[PDB]
Design a protein around this nucleic acid. Structure first.
Ligand SMILES: [Mg+2]
Ligand SMILES: [Mg+2]
Ligand SMILES: [Mg+2]
Ligand SMILES: [Mg+2]
Ligand SMILES: [Mg+2]
Ligand SMILES: [Mg+2]
Ligand SMILES: [Mg+2]
Ligand SMILES: [Mg+2]
Ligand SMILES: [Mg+2]
Ligand SMILES: [Mg+2]
Ligand SMILES: [Mg+2]
Ligand SMILES: [Mg+2]
Ligand SMILES: [Mg+2]
Ligand SMILES: [Mg+2]
Ligand SMILES: [Mg+2]
Ligand SMILES: [Mg+2]
Ligand SMILES: [Mg+2]
Ligand SMILES: [Mg+2]
Ligand SMILES: [Mg+2]
Ligand SMILES: [Mg+2]
Ligand SMILES: [Mg+2]
Ligand SMILES: [Mg+2]
Ligand SMILES: [Mg+2]
Ligand SMILES: [Mg+2]
Ligand SMILES: [Mg+2]
Ligand SMILES: [Mg+2]
Ligand SMILES: [Mg+2]
Ligand SMILES: [Mg+2]
Ligand SMILES: [Mg+2]
Ligand SMILES: [Mg+2]
Ligand SMILES: [Mg+2]
Ligand SMILES: [Mg+2]
Ligand SMILES: [Mg+2]
Ligand SMILES: [Mg+2]
Ligand SMILES: [Mg+2]
Lengths: 86, 99, 116, 136, 123
RNA sequence: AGAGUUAAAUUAUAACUAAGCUGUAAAAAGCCCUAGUUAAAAUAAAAUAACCCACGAAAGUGACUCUAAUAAUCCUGACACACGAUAGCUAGGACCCAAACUGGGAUUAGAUACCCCACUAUGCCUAGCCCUAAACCCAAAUAGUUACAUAACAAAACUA
């Protein structure tokens, strides 16, 4: 409100395609976590009920990180197998 | 008589030291269509993909140039006691036994 | 990089106080989560609306506007064939990863070890 | 380097639409609320040229929520605005609701030309506490 | 240097500016302060518009005053700065150069944590 | 613990503009001293950083700055001493927003509830009380060891 307007969260559509530029802006906000925050902040969420969220999120992030790594590590051996029908 | 420790101290696998970015010589002992299984002699063979240049030149018995990345592929993962082995080593293909 | 698990979990040794309380133990499972089927939206809605406006202005004589109508059916055929194609499309996978069957075999081939 | 989005308020940038500076192009406020949508098209001078609501467009208590209604309001809004002769519009969406995209499309399809989207959706830095969550 | 004074001042002409700075350092030298240096950072358009003394300002001049002062004092100078009619925002920070540089030796790599769960032959 | 400060948002209150605005699964009631825009103090609460894991004895503590400042050459120890989330009580201020209660509106066989709408004690400050929690990491303190060893499950087993 004290900041200069139109500098923030602004995309300018190129070659007149609107839908593309909107997708772009959406990708911005969702990349920064603002959509999850708006949606979060429609109602309240109590501090306890918040650390639960945090911890469940962070556990899940750890799991998915690890499992991802493991998958991409074992990726090589997806290759068609040499020894078949030994 | 040679003591084992002596055999160890003077071996090439020792002399090489750390595995990263080493320039190694290797041999192709098995082929599946795009994939060439290369024993450079270390413990485990590595795998490669036949390059676009001179495809038919790389055959079983052919000798090859390798840039050795890792002597073997291993890591420990979430809730694991022992780390996990691929039973291969990581290497890159440079040229074929440039002579 | 993977979030540090050091000091996080409530344990006998740990001098700190807990960070993560896992609901299910933190271990890589052997299998992988099955694919998530995506839901649909209302198909064609645009042409529907345009053709509505047309009949509103034209007092509902279908002969007055052929254009909105033919474009409407264009959308209907694009929609139906999009459904047929998304039915045969199961070779889609992740488009650059492998279908969860492959991941699961592959993961049973280099399982994760809790025991021993 | 073509179409860097945020054109500076300094004069180093010459790009004109209808021979106007980006500062002079009309602002269309879109407000997308879960039960509603409203567009108001205003001059760079802040003199309102157009107003359309999902209700003002003759929808009713629930149905006025939908994206249908949004594009509907958008069209007639751009009609009233086009009447006063605005070619180009820089748009701002306020709130996050059903008729965001629909209304923006509604301005285009309604024959009004769009340059920019910027999102001003109020994001508390932890000011006023929200109302309680619901089932409880 | 011990303390640092970030002066954002109402943008004026040169004489008025000079006046303001002068009387500022006078006030400081009166509360017992030793002034090291004066660094003019220019007249900038503020990042955002600041409302003080019933005037809402767009631009401002920027100044940096390094000085030594006794602990008891800082409040006094803050008060006399807040009172002032042409200060568009004051502040006083412990001068950055008292804070030490303790060498990042680098990243100490964190290994995966083991012996979380018991060894159990389950399933 | 003090003292000073405010970026986002919100609200008074004006200027325009349109008649609606709000609200749900769907509605109704409610408000049009309403709504969108443009201005704007106070009060309250502190996005991102945090995928960090620090500080405190615990409760607790994550907007900014400065002042004061974190017991013990360090073993255990009470019915003694000093603290102790929320809510609550006493007196005085504060009041954006939230909100037990209550009154409307739906839902329902009923609906003293879940959903909707207002509005209050109350959350906020200063001073004084009250001394309770799933105050739980349900895992006492201080030195150790990984020897011996699987009731079950959970955070593996044990000495002194
Ligand atoms: Mg404003
Ligand atoms: Mg987060
Ligand atoms: Mg501690
Ligand atoms: Mg605890
Ligand atoms: Mg559990
Ligand atoms: Mg917060
Ligand atoms: Mg309950
Ligand atoms: Mg287990
Ligand atoms: Mg106090
Ligand atoms: Mg403000
Ligand atoms: Mg306002
Ligand atoms: Mg207001
Ligand atoms: Mg609804
Ligand atoms: Mg009514
Ligand atoms: Mg966070
Ligand atoms: Mg924490
Ligand atoms: Mg101590
Ligand atoms: Mg003691
Ligand atoms: Mg208490
Ligand atoms: Mg209280
Ligand atoms: Mg009250
Ligand atoms: Mg008031
Ligand atoms: Mg209220
Ligand atoms: Mg009732
Ligand atoms: Mg019943
Ligand atoms: Mg229910
Ligand atoms: Mg009230
Ligand atoms: Mg409190
Ligand atoms: Mg607790
Ligand atoms: Mg607990
Ligand atoms: Mg107990
Ligand atoms: Mg004890
Ligand atoms: Mg102690
Ligand atoms: Mg022992
Ligand atoms: Mg058993």
């Amino acid at each position: 409100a004290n900041h200069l307007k139109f500098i923030a969260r602004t995309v300018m559509v190129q070659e007149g395609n609107v839908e593309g530029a909107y997708r772009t802006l959406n990708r911005i906000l969702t990349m920064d976590g603002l959509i999850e925050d708006i949606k979060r902040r429609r109602y309240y969420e109590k501090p306890c009920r918040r650390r639960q969220r945090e911890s469940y999120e962070t556990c899940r992030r750890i799991y998915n990180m690890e499992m991802a790594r493991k998958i991409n590590f074992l990726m090589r051996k997806n290759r068609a197998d040499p020894w078949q029908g030994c | 008589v040679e003591s084992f420790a002596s055999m160890l101290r003077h071996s090439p696998l020792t002399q090489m030291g750390p595995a990263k970015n080493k320039l190694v010589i290797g041999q192709i002992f098995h082929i599946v269509e795009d994939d060439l299984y290369i024993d450079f002699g270390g413990k485990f063979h590595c795998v490669c993909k036949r390059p676009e240049v001179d495809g038919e030149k790389y055959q079983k018995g052919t000798r090859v140039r390798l840039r050795l990345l890792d002597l073997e592929l291993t890591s420990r993962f979430l809730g694991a006691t022992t780390d996990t082995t691929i039973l291969e080593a990581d290497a890159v293909l440079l040229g074929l036994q440039e002579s | 990089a993977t979030p540090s698990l050091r000091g996080r979990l409530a344990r006998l040794g740990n001098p700190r106080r807990p960070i993560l309380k896992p609901n299910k133990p933190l271990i890589l499972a052997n299998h992988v989560g099955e694919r998530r089927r995506e839901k649909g939206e209302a198909t064609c809605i645009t042409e529907m609306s345009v053709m509505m406006a047309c009949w509103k202005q034209n007092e509902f004589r279908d002969e007055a506007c052929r254009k909105e109508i033919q474009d409407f059916f264009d959308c209907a055929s694009r929609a139906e064939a999009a459904r047929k194609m998304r039915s045969i499309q199961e070779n889609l996978g992740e488009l650059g990863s492998l279908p969860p069957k492959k991941l699961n075999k592959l993961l049973h081939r280099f399982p994760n070890k809790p025991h021993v | 380097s073509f179409s860097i989005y945020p054109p500076i308020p300094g004069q180093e940038n010459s790009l004109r639409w209808a021979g106007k500076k980006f500062e002079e192009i009309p602002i269309a406020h879109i407000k997308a609320s879960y039960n509603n949508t409203q567009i108001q098209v205003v001059s760079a001078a802040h003199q309102p040229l157009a107003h359309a609501s999902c209700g003002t467009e003759g929808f009713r208590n629930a149905k006025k929520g939908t994206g249908i209604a949004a594009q509907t309001a958008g069209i007639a809004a751009a009609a009233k605005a086009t009447g006063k002769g605005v070619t180009h519009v820089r748009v701002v969406v306020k709130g996050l609701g059903p008729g965001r995209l629909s209304a923006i499309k509604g301005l285009t399809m309604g024959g009004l030309e769009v340059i920019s989207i910027t999102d001003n959706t109020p994001i508390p830095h932890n000011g006023c506490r929200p109302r309680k969550a619901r089932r409880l | 240097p011990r303390y640092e004074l970030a002066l954002i001042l109402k943008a004026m002409q040169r004489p008025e500016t000079a006046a303001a700075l002068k009387r500022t350092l006078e006030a400081l030298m009166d509360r017992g302060a030793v002034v090291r240096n004066l660094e003019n950072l220019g007249e900038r358009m503020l990042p955002y518009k600041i409302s003080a003394h019933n005037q809402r300002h767009s631009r401002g001049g920027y100044f940096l005053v390094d000085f030594y002062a006794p602990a008891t004092t800082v409040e006094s100078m803050m008060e006399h700065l807040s009172r002032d009619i042409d200060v568009i925002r004051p502040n006083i920070v412990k001068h950055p150069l008292t804070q030490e540089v303790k060498e990042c030796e680098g990243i100490v790599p964190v290994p995966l944590e083991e012996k979380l769960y018991s060894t159990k032959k389950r399933k």
